[PDB]
Design a protein around this ligand. Structure first.
Ligand code: CL
Lengths: 10, 88
């Protein structure tokens, strides 16, 4: 059971 | 010295989010180079919570990854961003 995620720095 | 921890996105127990922050805190105390910080955190989480974890540590990056549910956190320790997640 998996999910996709974004991250971004300020 | 005392960097403010700020969680930006978490898909994990509140227990582990505190463990992440604490473990990243120890890593930043021990190491200055981002890849060494990331290695320390990744290896501790492989031990404490079973493989396979991945860790990115930096001041400027964006990411798109696939992680097991309940095993993803993205937080700032001071001015340093830490992405830690399980996939595999
Ligand atoms: Cl560095």
């Amino acid at each position: 059971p998996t999910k996709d995620s974004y991250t971004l720095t300020e | 010295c005392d960097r403010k921890a700020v969680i930006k996105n978490a898909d994990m127990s509140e227990e582990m989010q505190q463990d992440s922050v604490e473990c990243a805190t120890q890593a930043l105390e021990k190491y200055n180079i981002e890849k060494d910080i990331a290695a320390h955190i990744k290896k501790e989480f492989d031990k404490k919570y079973n493989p396979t974890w991945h860790c990115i540590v930096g001041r400027n990056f964006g990411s798109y990854v696939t992680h097991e549910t309940k095993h993803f956190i993205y937080f700032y320790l001071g001015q340093v961003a830490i992405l830690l997640f399980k996939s595999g």
